[PDB]
């Protein structure tokens, strides 16, 4: 069949030709198209894009930090409007944001060192438990918020929702994001949610199926246009494979050493602002 | 261009050929495909499907009842697991469900006659106010839940989310539904959300743009297969137009008499179980 990366490349070309000028939050310019979708097979391959080298180590590390439900920024290695707090900012305490919503949804916060077991909804364990109790369920949904929106009394809408789906012993995932930065964020997020799907499939005894990526405001930042035009002239190479190196029981038991990318052979890194 | 209804027809054909057998909640069989998307222009036309006659009066009446935030079933004209309550069931009091979430999101309920002004989040007025204060916003999102899931302490996931989008004086809408009954529900919901978009555009001084319809579990009930095969042999006729008959100021001021479908020329009704 056609290489899955051709979808990404085709969407890039479509925004370049048919996108309309639209400003983002900071009043920076984009070309924008509303509503897009692409399907990447996860069967016997892994959609780490090859037309530029994607920062796989960052993908994997950040996903593990999310799964941990961590609110300590230092734990990551070592859009600055997310502001609040004096000495708390200093410590690297980010407040009740990111994976704190995946694992402790709606739990009253204390500090990043506080022990939140059993506080709030564990959206991720909920999804895994449902896959096990009722694989046919059409409600296998987890949501994630932008920290910026998180007054949260406000009933703020999600930034992204992942719906999982099970048929014939295969697990599929659809990510809906309200906006997608096509040049920087989108290649990263394809790897990240395809990884999440691989991890969930592993622990629930299923095979990965498809990753479907859906966007609302799919945009290209104006200064990404020239690099993206160049990237478009490159020919995708066969996707690599992802290997899980031992049998893992619980989602919290994965560590970066359990994962191996094989046959990854990308074009060179492109630096985008 | 190709008639927009060809997308619907093409999705129907794809589920017939490539859908996999999957059971729904009641253990009734479907053919199912996970992840689909279609774009219907709302510019100078209205996507009331023509390959069977769609119940336009029902579409319009139900949408108005939702916009009213009504929990009185009698107010509609005159999946029975949504159960709870003795004399409350009798009165036609449905509890805090449907448009009660659009207009009074998270408000503690009393009874269907109770006066809830200013209680809970008004998701619909929120969306309209944002279109007016910041048309560029990527957070113009309203959500809707299946009444069945609404313990609601449970932080249950939405059944559907609508994201709105504004560029060049045009309002677009993307509906993401976690599951879509392609034979019965989907033609109805295309009309319903395209109508909602028309109404919102009218009051915010914008022109309708696109309606994008995205699904998670897109399915065909087994007993809809023969009628759908027949419907597929029919040639779409040009979409009709929708006319708003007077200038309307507030979303709550629309009534069924303000709307007129023109040039609607469908194939005959198909009865589907």
Curated annotation (Swiss-Prot), chains A, B:
Task: Give the source species.
Answer: Homo sapiens (Human)
Spell out the PROSITE patterns in the cross-references: THYMIDYLATE_SYNTHASE
Pfam families membership:
Thymidylat_synt (PF00303)
Q: Which residues bind (6R)-5,10-methylene-5,6,7,8-tetrahydrofolate?
A: 181
The domain of life for this entry's organism is Eukaryota
Query: Source gene?
Result: TYMS
Any GO BP: tetrahydrofolate interconversion
Pathway of action: Pyrimidine metabolism; dTTP biosynthesis
For dUMP, which residues are the binding ones? 25, 138-139, 158-159, 178-181, 189, 219-221
Quaternary structure (record): Homodimer.
Recorded GO molecular functions are: folic acid binding; mRNA regulatory element binding translation repressor activity; sequence-specific mRNA binding; thymidylate synthase activity
Associated disorder is:
Dyskeratosis congenita, digenic: A form of dyskeratosis congenita, a rare multisystem disorder caused by defective telomere maintenance. It is characterized by progressive bone marrow failure, and the clinical triad of reticulated skin hyperpigmentation, nail dystrophy, and mucosal leukoplakia. Common but variable features include premature graying, aplastic anemia, low platelets, osteoporosis, pulmonary fibrosis, and liver fibrosis among others. Early mortality is often associated with bone marrow failure, infections, fatal pulmonary complications, or malignancy.
HAMAP family, sorted: Thymidy_synth_bact
Its recorded name reads Thymidylate synthase
Q: Which UniProt keywords apply?
A: Cytoplasm, Disease variant, Dyskeratosis congenita, Isopeptide bond, Membrane, Methyltransferase, Mitochondrion, Mitochondrion inner membrane, Nucleotide biosynthesis, Nucleus, Phosphoprotein, Transferase, Ubl conjugation
Q: Does the keyword ATP-binding apply?
A: no
Role description: Catalyzes the reductive methylation of 2'-deoxyuridine 5'-monophosphate (dUMP) to thymidine 5'-monophosphate (dTMP), using the cosubstrate, 5,10- methylenetetrahydrofolate (CH2H4folate) as a 1-carbon donor and reductant and contributes to the de novo mitochondrial thymidylate biosynthesis pathway.
The family database entries (InterPro entries) matched by this protein are listed as: Thymidate_synth/dCMP_Mease (IPR045097), Thymidate_synth/dCMP_Mease_dom (IPR023451), Thymidate_synth/dCMP_Mease_sf (IPR036926), Thymidylate_synthase (IPR000398), Thymidylate_synthase_AS (IPR020940)
Q: Of which family is this protein a member? A: Belongs to the thymidylate synthase family.
């Amino acid at each position: 069949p056609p290489h899955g990366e051709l979808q990404y490349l085709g969407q890039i070309q479509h925004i370049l030709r048919c996108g309309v000028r639209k400003d983002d939050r900071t009043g920076t310019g984009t070309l924008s198209v509303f509503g897009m979708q692409a399907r990447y097979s996860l069967r016997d391959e892994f959609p780490l894009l090859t037309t530029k080298r994607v920062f796989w180590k960052g993908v994997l590390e950040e996903l593990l930090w999310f799964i941990k439900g961590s609110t300590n920024a230092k734990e990551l290695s070592s859009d600055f409007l997310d502001s609040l707090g004096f000495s708390t900012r200093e410590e690297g305490d980010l407040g009740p944001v990111y994976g704190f919503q995946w694992r402790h949804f709606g739990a009253e916060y204390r500090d990043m060192e506080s022990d939140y077991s059993g506080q709030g909804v564990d959206q991720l364990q909920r999804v895994i438990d449902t896959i096990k109790t009722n694989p046919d369920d059409r409600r296998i949904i987890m949501c994630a918020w932008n920290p910026r929106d998180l007054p949260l009394k406000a009933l703020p809408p999600c930034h992204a929702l992942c719906q999982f789906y099970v048929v014939n012993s295969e697990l599929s995932c659809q990510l809906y994001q309200r906006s997608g930065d096509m040049g920087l964020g989108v290649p990263f997020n394809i790897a990240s949610y395809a990884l999440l799907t691989y991890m969930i499939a592993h622990i629930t005894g299923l095979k990965p199926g498809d990753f479907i990526h859906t966007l609302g405001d799919a945009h290209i930042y104006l200064n990404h246009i020239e690099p993206l035009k160049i990237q478009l002239q490159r020919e995708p190479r066969p996707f690599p494979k992802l290997r899980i190196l031992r049998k893992v029981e619980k989602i919290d038991d994965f560590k970066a050493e359990d994962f191996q990318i094989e046959g990854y052979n990308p074009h060179p890194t492109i630096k985008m602002e």
